[PDB]
Amino acid sequence: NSVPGAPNRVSFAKLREPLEVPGLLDVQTDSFEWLIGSPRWRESAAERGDVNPVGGLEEVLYELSPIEDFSGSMSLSFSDPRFDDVKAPVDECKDKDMTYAAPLFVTAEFINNNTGEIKSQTVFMGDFPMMTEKGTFIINGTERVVVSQLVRSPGVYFDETIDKSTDKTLHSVKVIPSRGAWLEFDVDKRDTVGVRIDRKRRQPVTVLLKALGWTSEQIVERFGFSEIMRSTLEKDNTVGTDEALLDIYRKLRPGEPPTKESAQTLLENLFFKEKRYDLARVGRYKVNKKLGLHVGEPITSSTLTEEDVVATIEYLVRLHEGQTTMTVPGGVEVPVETDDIDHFGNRRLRTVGELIQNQIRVGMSRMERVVRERMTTQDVEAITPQTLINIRPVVAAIKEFFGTSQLSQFMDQNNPLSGLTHKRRLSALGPGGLSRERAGLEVRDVHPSHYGRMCPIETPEGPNIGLIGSLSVYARVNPFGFIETPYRKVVDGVVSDEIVYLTADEEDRHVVAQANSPIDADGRFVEPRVLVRRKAGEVEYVPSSEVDYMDVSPRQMVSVATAMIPFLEHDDANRALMGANMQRQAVPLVRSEAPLVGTGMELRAAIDAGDVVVAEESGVIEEVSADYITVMHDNGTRRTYRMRKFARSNHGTCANQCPIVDAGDRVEAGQVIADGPCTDDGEMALGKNLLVAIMPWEGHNYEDAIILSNRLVEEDVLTSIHIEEHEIDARDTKLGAEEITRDIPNISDEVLADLDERGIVRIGAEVRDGDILVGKVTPKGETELTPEERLLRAIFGEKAREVRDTSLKVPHGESGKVIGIRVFSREDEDELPAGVNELVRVYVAQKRKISDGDKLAGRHGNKGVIGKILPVEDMPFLADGTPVDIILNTHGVPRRMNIGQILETHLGWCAHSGWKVDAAKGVPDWAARLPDELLEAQPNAIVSTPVFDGAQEAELQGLLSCTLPNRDGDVLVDADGKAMLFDGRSGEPFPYPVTVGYMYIMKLHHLVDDKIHARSTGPYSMITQQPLGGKAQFGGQRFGEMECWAMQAYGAAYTLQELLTIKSDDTVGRVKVYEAIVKGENIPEPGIPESFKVLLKELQSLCLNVEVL
Amino acid sequence: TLLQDQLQSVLDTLSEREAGVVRLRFGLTDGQPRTLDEIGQVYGVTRERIRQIESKTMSKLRHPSRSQVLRDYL
Amino acid sequence: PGNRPLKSLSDLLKGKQGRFRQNLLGKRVDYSGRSVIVVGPQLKLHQCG
């Protein structure tokens, strides 16, 4: 529905969602946006209530600004928070290699304090990181990608703690103010007070409490019952806040004349210093959140308060003791209890500006924390709002930040969603964040909540799962890093047709209704009783009659990627998420196809590619051609909207962007306009709805073995091309520099008879390996040779030159046609790194025509190598001739799970083949229901279904029974799954019926050349001359130690030894036997651990002398 | 040295004097070039007499089979 | 500078670079036959891809 270019992949909606697809993607941006704070977002936020939100900026400004000296006589302030505007299709930078950005102006204002005066100055600030419609930032035509680090909400937090000693429940809580130090109270073993602050032994609190002014009375009074503390007033022995205080204070420093400071100053400072003591408003906010506190209090500050301090303290006491709720004076009550890290309300998440903002923050700070410095020194008088500016270091970082911004991580432009996934991708680790070398599984741990939060399934994978992820599906997330699941907030067998974005918490209080659930068409789930998670998410049954809220659909904590394959309910999650991640590693070959089957996700998902040239106006078409297309913006109005092609990925792939229609036709904004990449008929082309079947065969689909057609070739089905950029600079240095001529020493002809006038050939030109390349050259040196030579040269007049004959030449597995020409000169002004005056970068096609053996696959994780190629003929094949797509061993699924593969595929041939319900007279019962409408399948046509919703077996099965028998109204197929092809070879019948079908799959960014290597020899650590592994190099595989042990298990000695010597780095035998070799002869028998020799020396060295004899 | 001595071999593919003649012609023999009178000095003749036969036997070897016999040494 | 303390006598076969440790470590060397694989029904012991 709601789809301009809509077809219909007819699905199986047994259900309904009034709700509809959010926009995801939005995300950050918005932030950014908000961070910015556009009168957009401004409007945005602005709407949906929202008092006085603020572009993540200001703030900045005001969180410091305005300004002033320490002399209290020069007053600066700010203003004009804002920017200018970019200067490119970005696309420009893209090509133009720089990054995309737009200038910043802002208008602070200094003011004397003496006279007090005026120094505004709408100062420029910075051209700036300018996002993308992809909501992104492709530094210098080059973007990484940032995800947010999950972050359990900071704050003073609570628990019981037992002591096997006595087992007593020394509960407690910390304090953790942003940037504010620490200080914590803790159910003492023996009486009483988990006093000490951010690591200071312990005290009698009140010494601090009283220390601020507290008659031991006042407490006991308000705090005698409240007896354990009474002990505190006991052992507290010492008195006089001050007496303490100062004494404390020593407890602080320690050792120092307790000046009144000791009596207060820093103390307050310490944590009454929003000057520096600076928790988090949201926390701040929290806080109240903690405890129905001031609450009625649109507040904001680091305003520490002994007030609440003690408050929650006696909270402690009251609890350790067991006590439900209770209301502090005024402060409405709170049911007592510890806390949790685990749950997610415990647990916010970060976001750009936020970051940024932090970054930046110090940035100014920094750069800021200077004018101060200078402010002063910067004599009064003529010292303009300018005079003292220099954000430079800011962007320096900032800018920089990206450099280092390890979390910005180059968008794997391998497929769309893949890139997506990358988007929504989410963890909580790294810079300042965790260091997996320190985190208990729990980190990875499951837990209830979780639903409607992030794909249960997917995750990292190596030592990595339970560490990272994304969102679930819908539920937006807090203006403060917390999900926003709306719900079927039910009402009296009549759910309240109503979103309710929810932070798990709260909520937690509430009643877990069930999607997939039969209402009396009214909310009135027709049963009296139901189930539902409870306090512990206690997925508990119950009488329908009682919940507050149901849900928002089925399937939600899901991921998109998650959201992708049915039969789940039959299939290994392991295997699953496996396929999940898998999913991505398709490889947009060429053909473009969609599984005739597949849910709705799909392009409606894919649309969220938001990539395809896609309508902008109900305009009629206009001129068209594969670069763009003029667009009759029917307001007269037009715009030859463009279209890209032949431009590499992060992974070597075109810019292709295939059209749709006709320069004359007529259509309307937002509707499609032209695919391109992973973009089958407006849709991730992703595989091949492909026959094949069931046998494990002649041992070739065995142990992962895999048996594969061939026609394929021919068919071509399997290829695209791939892209290196091809670079090689012209440099500058000692003996001269790095020329790029075309002349060359005793170079072959043609070898040159090929390049351009002065080096490399010309675009779209074919090659191979070795193939020389550049037109480079460099001075050689100056250190004589043997007369012998020269002489020799005199002998052959080959009057040698003297220049470091230098250039480039094609390595291995390499060919195609000329492309790149990023020949960019320093000298030609083309800014570039030192000692260089230019550089080109180039590209070449190569259509990868799919080797067998390799690996592909599709849904049901159901990965699959690519064993053998196999000619057509020679092939089991329709009794109607037509043979397989390939075949399939058995076995795994059993010990695996994923049989939908089976079903789905049944299905496959089905759809692929269509049918019609011959319900006629009446009803296929199992029919008697369901998307009726179908009734049939026009042999082969569009077919989707819901996730946790779709027809059934029997049905499905019975669907089997159903049919669109072929030409000869035939169905070699059995209402059964197993027919009986014969042999494209020997040919005869088979033993028994033949299970078979079809399956779209996908193809792999992982094969030989990805990893096709060894190494005969090459470079060698100018230090530990080991195989200098490298590009030019094959690396030359390293070796293991066990291994060695293996030897041992034999003792080939030598062998190993040898190694150690040889290929290890036997300078000699390397040379030496290398010779031998060269001379092929009873090899220079293994010598001596040489070096080892060193040792000795090495020893001696320390008076160490000794010896064997 | 495959070269080198391989040469030396070639260095014998003709006559005699022409050695120190030429070996000396760059001290090749003794590792140090010289002068027509420097060497031929020994034979007592003329820088004339020297480089005459000299470059001549060059021609000898300037000949190709004189070469390819050591050409890949190129 | 960078208060980088400095390598002592001492070190050497001391620290990870224990020429000790040294040996016991495997390493990279020439002619590294490493790649994926398949069987080859047509098989005979000794045989191989």
Short mmCIF file of N, CA, C and O in Angstrom, two decimals, chain A residues 698-700 853 1011 1013-1018 1020 1026-1027 1029 1034-1041 1063-1064 1098 1102, chain C residues 9-10 12-13 19 21-42:
data_model
loop_
_atom_site.label_atom_id
_atom_site.label_comp_id
_atom_site.label_asym_id
_atom_site.label_seq_id
_atom_site.Cartn_x
_atom_site.Cartn_y
_atom_site.Cartn_z
N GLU A 698 27.36 -38.58 -5.07
CA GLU A 698 28.68 -39.06 -5.46
C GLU A 698 29.77 -38.45 -4.60
O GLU A 698 30.89 -38.24 -5.05
N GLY A 699 29.43 -38.15 -3.36
CA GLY A 699 30.35 -37.35 -2.58
C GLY A 699 30.79 -36.09 -3.27
O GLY A 699 31.91 -36.03 -3.78
N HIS A 700 29.93 -35.08 -3.34
CA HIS A 700 30.32 -33.80 -3.90
C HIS A 700 29.51 -32.68 -3.30
O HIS A 700 29.74 -31.51 -3.61
N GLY A 853 33.79 -24.35 -6.87
CA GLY A 853 34.41 -24.54 -5.58
C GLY A 853 34.01 -23.52 -4.55
O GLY A 853 33.76 -23.88 -3.40
N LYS A 1011 41.95 -13.91 -0.95
CA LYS A 1011 42.85 -14.60 -0.04
C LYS A 1011 43.80 -15.54 -0.78
O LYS A 1011 44.35 -16.48 -0.20
N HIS A 1013 46.91 -16.71 -2.02
CA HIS A 1013 48.28 -16.28 -1.79
C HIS A 1013 49.13 -17.39 -1.21
O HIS A 1013 48.65 -18.42 -0.74
N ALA A 1014 50.43 -17.12 -1.25
CA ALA A 1014 51.46 -17.94 -0.63
C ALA A 1014 52.66 -17.03 -0.43
O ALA A 1014 52.59 -16.05 0.31
N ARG A 1015 53.75 -17.40 -1.09
CA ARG A 1015 54.88 -16.51 -1.34
C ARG A 1015 56.15 -17.33 -1.47
O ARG A 1015 56.52 -18.07 -0.56
N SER A 1016 56.80 -17.20 -2.62
CA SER A 1016 58.07 -17.86 -2.89
C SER A 1016 59.21 -17.18 -2.17
O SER A 1016 60.18 -17.83 -1.78
N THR A 1017 59.12 -15.87 -2.01
CA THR A 1017 60.24 -15.07 -1.54
C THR A 1017 59.97 -13.63 -1.93
O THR A 1017 59.08 -13.38 -2.75
N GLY A 1018 60.70 -12.71 -1.34
CA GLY A 1018 60.60 -11.32 -1.71
C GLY A 1018 61.30 -10.43 -0.72
O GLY A 1018 62.53 -10.42 -0.61
N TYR A 1020 61.96 -8.90 3.24
CA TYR A 1020 62.42 -9.56 4.44
C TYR A 1020 62.89 -8.52 5.45
O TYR A 1020 63.76 -7.70 5.15
N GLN A 1026 62.59 -11.41 8.15
CA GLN A 1026 61.60 -12.38 7.78
C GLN A 1026 60.83 -11.92 6.56
O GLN A 1026 60.93 -10.77 6.14
N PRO A 1027 60.01 -12.81 6.00
CA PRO A 1027 59.25 -12.46 4.80
C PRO A 1027 58.54 -11.14 4.98
O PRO A 1027 57.46 -11.05 5.56
N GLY A 1029 56.10 -9.45 4.41
CA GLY A 1029 54.81 -9.62 3.79
C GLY A 1029 54.28 -8.27 3.34
O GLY A 1029 54.57 -7.24 3.94
N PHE A 1034 53.46 -11.77 -1.04
CA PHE A 1034 52.29 -12.61 -0.78
C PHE A 1034 52.09 -12.68 0.72
O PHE A 1034 51.38 -13.56 1.23
N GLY A 1035 52.73 -11.76 1.43
CA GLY A 1035 52.96 -11.92 2.84
C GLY A 1035 53.99 -13.00 3.08
O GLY A 1035 55.02 -12.76 3.71
N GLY A 1036 53.73 -14.20 2.55
CA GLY A 1036 54.50 -15.36 2.94
C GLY A 1036 54.05 -15.81 4.31
O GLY A 1036 54.54 -15.32 5.33
N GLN A 1037 53.11 -16.74 4.35
CA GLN A 1037 52.46 -17.14 5.58
C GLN A 1037 53.44 -17.34 6.72
O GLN A 1037 54.51 -17.93 6.56
N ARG A 1038 53.05 -16.85 7.89
CA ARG A 1038 53.69 -17.15 9.16
C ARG A 1038 53.39 -18.59 9.53
O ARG A 1038 52.54 -19.24 8.92
N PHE A 1039 54.08 -19.09 10.54
CA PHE A 1039 53.98 -20.49 10.93
C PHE A 1039 53.79 -20.58 12.43
O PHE A 1039 54.19 -19.69 13.17
N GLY A 1040 53.21 -21.69 12.87
CA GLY A 1040 52.85 -21.88 14.25
C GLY A 1040 53.77 -22.81 15.00
O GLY A 1040 54.72 -23.36 14.44
N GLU A 1041 53.48 -23.03 16.28
CA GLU A 1041 54.47 -23.60 17.18
C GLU A 1041 54.12 -25.04 17.54
O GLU A 1041 54.96 -25.93 17.44
N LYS A 1063 63.77 -20.53 4.71
CA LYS A 1063 62.63 -19.63 4.64
C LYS A 1063 62.39 -18.80 5.89
O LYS A 1063 61.84 -17.71 5.77
N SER A 1064 62.74 -19.30 7.07
CA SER A 1064 62.87 -18.45 8.24
C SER A 1064 63.56 -17.14 7.90
O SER A 1064 62.89 -16.11 7.78
N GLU A 1098 76.67 -11.81 22.99
CA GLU A 1098 75.56 -11.36 23.80
C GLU A 1098 75.81 -11.62 25.27
O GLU A 1098 75.39 -10.85 26.13
N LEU A 1102 78.22 -9.53 29.35
CA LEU A 1102 77.99 -9.24 30.75
C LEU A 1102 78.94 -10.01 31.65
O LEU A 1102 78.55 -10.39 32.75
N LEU C 9 70.55 -3.46 29.51
CA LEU C 9 71.25 -4.70 29.21
C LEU C 9 70.28 -5.85 29.28
O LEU C 9 69.52 -6.10 28.34
N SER C 10 70.32 -6.58 30.38
CA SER C 10 69.08 -7.01 31.01
C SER C 10 68.07 -7.53 30.00
O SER C 10 67.66 -8.69 30.08
N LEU C 12 66.77 -7.98 26.01
CA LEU C 12 67.45 -8.94 25.17
C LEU C 12 66.69 -10.25 25.06
O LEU C 12 65.57 -10.25 24.57
N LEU C 13 67.26 -11.34 25.53
CA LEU C 13 66.42 -12.47 25.84
C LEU C 13 65.51 -12.20 27.02
O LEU C 13 64.76 -13.09 27.43
N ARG C 19 65.15 -13.96 23.26
CA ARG C 19 65.64 -14.86 22.22
C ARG C 19 65.34 -16.29 22.60
O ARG C 19 65.16 -17.15 21.73
N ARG C 21 61.99 -17.03 24.18
CA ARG C 21 60.72 -16.71 23.54
C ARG C 21 60.86 -16.60 22.04
O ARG C 21 60.19 -17.34 21.31
N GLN C 22 61.72 -15.70 21.58
CA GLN C 22 62.17 -15.67 20.20
C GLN C 22 61.81 -16.94 19.45
O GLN C 22 60.72 -17.04 18.87
N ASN C 23 62.71 -17.91 19.45
CA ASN C 23 62.44 -19.16 18.75
C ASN C 23 61.01 -19.61 18.92
O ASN C 23 60.24 -19.60 17.95
N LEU C 24 60.62 -19.96 20.14
CA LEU C 24 59.31 -20.55 20.39
C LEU C 24 58.17 -19.69 19.91
O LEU C 24 57.41 -19.18 20.74
N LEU C 25 57.98 -19.55 18.60
CA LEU C 25 57.00 -18.58 18.14
C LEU C 25 56.50 -18.82 16.72
O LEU C 25 55.62 -18.08 16.27
N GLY C 26 57.02 -19.81 16.00
CA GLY C 26 56.63 -19.96 14.61
C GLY C 26 56.93 -18.69 13.86
O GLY C 26 57.58 -17.80 14.41
N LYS C 27 56.46 -18.55 12.62
CA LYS C 27 56.79 -17.36 11.85
C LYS C 27 56.48 -17.58 10.39
O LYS C 27 56.11 -18.68 9.98
N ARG C 28 56.62 -16.52 9.61
CA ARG C 28 56.34 -16.61 8.19
C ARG C 28 57.60 -16.95 7.41
O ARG C 28 58.71 -16.51 7.75
N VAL C 29 57.42 -17.74 6.35
CA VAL C 29 58.52 -18.20 5.52
C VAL C 29 58.00 -18.50 4.12
O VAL C 29 56.80 -18.48 3.86
N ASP C 30 58.93 -18.80 3.22
CA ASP C 30 58.67 -18.87 1.80
C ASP C 30 57.67 -19.97 1.45
O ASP C 30 57.56 -20.99 2.13
N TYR C 31 56.94 -19.76 0.36
CA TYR C 31 56.20 -20.82 -0.30
C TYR C 31 55.07 -21.32 0.60
O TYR C 31 55.02 -22.48 1.00
N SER C 32 54.16 -20.40 0.91
CA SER C 32 53.13 -20.63 1.92
C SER C 32 51.85 -21.09 1.25
O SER C 32 50.95 -20.29 0.95
N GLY C 33 51.75 -22.39 1.04
CA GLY C 33 50.56 -22.95 0.46
C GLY C 33 49.39 -22.81 1.40
O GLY C 33 49.15 -23.66 2.25
N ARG C 34 48.66 -21.71 1.24
CA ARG C 34 47.49 -21.51 2.07
C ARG C 34 46.35 -21.02 1.21
O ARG C 34 46.46 -20.01 0.51
N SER C 35 45.25 -21.76 1.26
CA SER C 35 44.06 -21.44 0.49
C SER C 35 42.96 -22.41 0.88
O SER C 35 43.20 -23.45 1.50
N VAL C 36 41.75 -22.04 0.52
CA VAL C 36 40.69 -22.99 0.63
C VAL C 36 40.93 -24.09 -0.38
O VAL C 36 41.98 -24.18 -1.00
N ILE C 37 39.91 -24.88 -0.59
CA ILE C 37 40.11 -26.31 -0.73
C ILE C 37 38.84 -26.97 -1.23
O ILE C 37 37.74 -26.44 -1.11
N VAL C 38 39.02 -28.18 -1.72
CA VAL C 38 37.94 -29.11 -1.97
C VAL C 38 38.53 -30.51 -1.92
O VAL C 38 39.75 -30.68 -1.99
N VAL C 39 37.67 -31.49 -1.81
CA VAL C 39 38.08 -32.87 -1.98
C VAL C 39 38.32 -33.07 -3.46
O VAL C 39 38.57 -32.11 -4.20
N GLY C 40 38.25 -34.32 -3.91
CA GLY C 40 38.45 -34.65 -5.30
C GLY C 40 38.14 -36.10 -5.56
O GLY C 40 38.99 -36.87 -6.00
N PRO C 41 36.88 -36.46 -5.39
CA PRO C 41 36.48 -37.87 -5.32
C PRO C 41 37.49 -38.84 -5.92
O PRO C 41 38.12 -39.60 -5.20
N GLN C 42 37.62 -38.83 -7.24
CA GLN C 42 38.83 -39.30 -7.89
C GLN C 42 40.06 -39.20 -7.00
O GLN C 42 40.90 -38.33 -7.24
#
